[PDB]
Ligand binder design. Structure first.
Ligand code: ADP
Length: 249
């Protein structure tokens, strides 16, 4: 279960997403009053593990909506017409369960400029065309490779708003570290230091660092968590050791 309080370092990105969906949904009345149709799709982009799915999930909680997630790669099918059918069913289901947030991760797998997948693409855009705003089912897509995308994905009525979800900067990381260490008791711990030593980390790495910290404490049998635990969790999660593994698997 996810809420805005489970998210760190993305204050303006959240506001933007909220302004694009939460705001209209609540007071749609008041948008037509100004001549602006509420967006149908929002595209989130940036490197992996930095909060894109989190924002979409938490947004879904806050508007009390069904949250349906599909990974783009799985809409690529060996057999003809299947990719398109799935997208069709996806949208039917999302109506069945309205209101809903559809979250299509790795939308690049389908929205790249073999030709079957373009069929699959046409279907989705077809689906957005025809949904009609004001507006009960909303789509959120995510990619780490945005520059790839067919611009027909981005025309108005389709993935209008773009929001970059970056690697966390120094303060972001601090915020994120707090989110995932809020429910531990630490004593020796300076998190500014941890934030300083993790340049380039993602939100996920940082969660992993807090997680590896607490278990390090456990394996050395204490009940609290200390700076040393974090210094080695930082060294475990980041750094060659897990690096080579990745090059290895
Ligand atoms: N901005 C963030 N704030 C708090 N936790 C985060 C953040 N970004 C990533 N995480 C942690 O990493 C995990 C993956 O985040 P997710 O939103 O799935 O990343 P992606 O951008 O790959 O969709 C989440 O479960 C979350 O706990």
């Amino acid at each position: 279960n996810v809420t805005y309080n489970d998210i760190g370092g993305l204050k303006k990105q959240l506001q933007e997403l909220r302004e694009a969906i939460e705001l209209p949904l609540k007071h749609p009345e008041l948008f037509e009053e100004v001549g602006i149709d509420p967006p149908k799709g929002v595209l989130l982009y940036g490197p992996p593990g930095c909060g894109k799915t989190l924002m979409a999930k938490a947004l879904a909680h806050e508007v009390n909506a069904t949250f349906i997630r599909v990974v783009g790669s799985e809409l690529v099918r060996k057999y003809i017409g299947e990719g398109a059918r799935l997208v069709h069913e996806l949208f039917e289901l999302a109506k069945e369960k309205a209101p809903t947030i559809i979250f299509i991760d790795e939308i690049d797998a389908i929205g790249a400029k073999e030709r079957e997948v373009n069929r699959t693409l046409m279907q989705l855009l077809a689906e957005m065309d025809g949904f009609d705003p004001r507006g009960n089912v909303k789509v959120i897509a995510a990619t780490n490779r945005p520059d790839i995308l067919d611009p027909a994905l981005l025309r108005p009525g389709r993935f209008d708003r773009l929001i970059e979800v970056p690697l966390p900067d120094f303060e972001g990381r601090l915020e994120i570290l707090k989110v995932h260490t809020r429910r531990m008791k630490l004593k020796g711990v300076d998190l500014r230091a941890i934030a300083e030593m993790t340049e380039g980390a993602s939100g996920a790495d940082l969660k992993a660092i807090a997680t590896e910290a607490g278990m390090f404490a456990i394996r050395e049998r204490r009940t609290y968590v200390t700076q040393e635990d974090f210094l080695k969790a930082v060294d475990k999660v980041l750094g060659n050791e897990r690096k080579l593994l990745q090059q290895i698997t």
